[model samples]
Target: ATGTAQAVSEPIDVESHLGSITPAAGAQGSDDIGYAIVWIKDQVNDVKLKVTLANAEQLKPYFKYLQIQITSGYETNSTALGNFSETKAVISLDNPSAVIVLDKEDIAVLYPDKTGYTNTSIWVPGEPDKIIVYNETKPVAILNFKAFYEAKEGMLFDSLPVIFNFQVLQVG
Candidate 1:
């Protein structure tokens, strides 16, 4: 998802126990509490992904925030080839995944799939990479999706404006 006016300072510290990790009480006091979930026996590197176009281009000035959901799945891990396959999100610029989550920095891409999801892919625009593991059990991959915000040069990629059909559960 995207953010307007240089990211929202929403009090993520206000906890509600939404079944996932919520910004801790003081996590925001330092602005260093970047959080998300990971597999039971894995760290952030093992998270799977799914990508969706949250919004269309040309709506950036009016956009405020892009809400994203992170979920887990079982069909993501692979012993070879990579943790993702054709079904993994954010594989290309064409077939965008519906379960994608874009970060403020745009360096990470996260999405939902049949496997347990926690973090977004640590991707930098124009750079192609691969995911490899010794076991075919870690279904942690990133979902493919488009970002609402455009990229400059360092963190994110140069992408078009995105229009999102925010889910009702994404109500803020």
Candidate 2:
């Protein structure tokens, strides 16, 4: 079982398969933070996905699906972009479904808040200010972040990195 390291011999197409749905706000003073609902079509855990080709004259077709892992409530960098921990499933030209969780954190590591200002600048104090993006000139895949605010010392730092992990799957 050996072949070219970068050969496209295998007819496989990989793509994202995660789904996200945000929950509504809870009742007043219920101390109930809303949860996210995630789902995907035509996929189940540990199941192999596949696709078929009709004939040689036909164009090669490949489809894929994958499961996305969600991170619990966490803060985002001030200037990061793209969602967190996203992985596409590599299938044999098969299109599958996947489910992934959404982030409540306004400041995600993937999407940072690299503004020269404070997270509180956008909203009221003590509220979640995930990522503050500066799409105009900020670096791609980069962010500016302030971990904490020192009322005495002022903002802590600037510019942070957006990072997350994901999984890749293949069906034989």
Candidate 3:
């Protein structure tokens, strides 16, 4: 008798190592202000996506800080997408293919305590970090995400809260 090989029929299990690009906060999303992930590539070397989102017409806001947070994920820390050391410690818009496109007046801040991260180099002029959005000039952003992983994997759509800070900013 000869040798026989097993047929590999099971699909590989893998995580995208990426975060969700969509946000739906108490009707915070509208047809005019919706988020999306324009997928460019989904396999081979890596994955690519162009994210776009914004709000308002002429700018008149209340919230002090609009925060984009990963509320749930297999890898997210209590406050971030990943913990310290084990998996990309420095989270919140980590390494990407590098395509910056935010507003001219809007500012993104990091809220990580103790030890934080610095991304987007535009972080506070001299700073560089956080997914925190602060602005009264109509928030808007157009960015990209590019990472290497499996073909159908690495879609770490880290679910989110996308909370905005305010004493009591009611939507009515």
Candidate 4:
């Protein structure tokens, strides 16, 4: 330690690092039920997810492998939504070699029957829907989500802040 110590300046790209797939709460009054806050966790026991980037895509460019979690499901308000039945997580993966499920929490979740309409799922009603929406929204490297939906007191709320997360990775 002496007078005039040399200091190295870091890179200017510090503003962006943590990948984001964060969602926002809906507008208007609360009642009925709809909307799922699907998010990813860095680890298995990420019960309280800390990474809050509120962006559109969740990117892991170093590994180039993407697949993970859905932290929140079915936004609720004052139990206005009617009785729901044991629902399901509907995921349609377009590629076989592109995705794989390591493990998913099981226990039949239900979609609520809100306001005017009703849900007649042939299964028993239970807890709110918690799902595993890993890959497929992401094709190997690039992850993108177009929009989100909210089904409340007989009304559907649609919000699309960011559409195109990744235009092209150009992996090759």
Candidate 5:
């Protein structure tokens, strides 16, 4: 008689919780600033990140010209292992306001095994420094951010809890 067993894999569980911005290391908030919270959800197909601002009105002036920098899978410092990966999102609005919810889907669409963006040259499974590796155990990524700013104005703002950490969850 012959018997075979299948290898089992786990899923990364973030618990769909909210955290305060820890602020990006060495980055300061602009004179006109606001408070914001970071929400991370592990969706069925992708990870969703939303930033809700308390002083959303303060950010209105720079809304159309603002850009949010997002880095994943590594600590804010350069000492972390693996390749460093990041992306940028531009908020476009005809009429800006105090309340804006930025989504990861707004920046890029990620496949289960690939990163989605305008560039397809960096999408590969084994490519060093260009691949996003999903972890099934513990927190596989440390999400970092740069203060929301207008690319043309050169202004910087401090975000609370600048760093958001995520972990995997086991159902069993």
Candidate 6:
């Protein structure tokens, strides 16, 4: 009953069994709306993800087949950005195929309105925690997101820190 907000899921940690992904700390950067924190998760409920070493010379060699969460938001000072209650039915990643090397440039292109990226009609209801992302028939990454709330206002805040979690299936 506080604003149009609901409960949120917990944060997930990234992990790999073999080889391992370098820059292991994962990547973090800001976007037009706000900022994004990208990382890999190990599982969804009980299913284990499959990740392997695709290229050893690059930043992350292992093709991490896991969940990736993108925490997006608007700046506290910005008013042009509107407010909302919860996530919608359609969710996707611009580079779900692991083809795009994730960086600030790539992060700027991720928006709900834009199309062409791998789209999935996955319905996330109520303080949602995770989602499944695919590259064609192959399920590549799992996504977990949490929208932050401000208790004092009793309404959803726009500039709150968002949580973007994921698992990598391939390396691009």
Best by TM-score: 5
- Give the count of colliding residue pairs in each prediction: 46, 25, 6, 1, 13, 20
- Estimate, for each residue in 1-172, the C-alpha lDDT of model 4 and write its tens digit: 2322246632111111122233234542211121223232221221211222223232222212222222122222224443222222211111101121212232122334333235322111222242222111210111111112222334333432321111111111
Question: Once model 4 is optimally superposed onto the true structure by TM-score, how far is the C-alpha of residue 9 displaced, in angstroms?
Answer: 48
Give candidate 4 regions above 4 Å deviation.
1-60, 68-73, 83-172
Candidate 3 clashing pairs, residues 3+ apart or interchain: 15-154, 16-154, 16-155, 118-128, 119-128, 119-129
Identify the leading candidate in terms of lDDT. 5
* TM-scores, one per candidate: 0.21, 0.18, 0.19, 0.18, 0.30, 0.18
Name the lDDT value of residue 55 in candidate 6: 29
lDDT of 3 at 20: 29
Better of 2 and 5 by lDDT: 5
Model 2 backbone overlap count = 25
Q: What's the distance in Å from true for residue 18, model 2?
A: 16
List, residue by residue over 97-142, the lDDT tens digit for candidate 2. Answer: 2332222222222224544444322211222442323333221121
TM-score of 4: 0.18
Q: How well does candidate 1 score on lDDT at residue 120?
A: 27
Error of 6 at 70 (Å): 12
Better of 3 and 5 by lDDT: 5
Model 1 RMSD, rounded to 1 decimal? 16.1
| Candidate 5: count of backbone clashes, pairs at least 3 residues apart or interchain | 13
RMSD of 3: 20.8
Q: State the weakest 10-residue window (summed lDDT) of model 3.
A: 163-172
Query: How far does residue 14 in candidate 4 sit from its true spot (Å)?
Result: 31
For candidate 6, lDDT tens digit of each residue in 40-72? 332222222222212212321232222223322
How well is each residue in 24-109 modelled by candidate 5, as lDDT tens digits? 33434422121222223342333443433333345444333433343343322112222445442222233221222233432222
RMSD of each: 16.1, 20.3, 20.8, 19.4, 14.6, 20.1
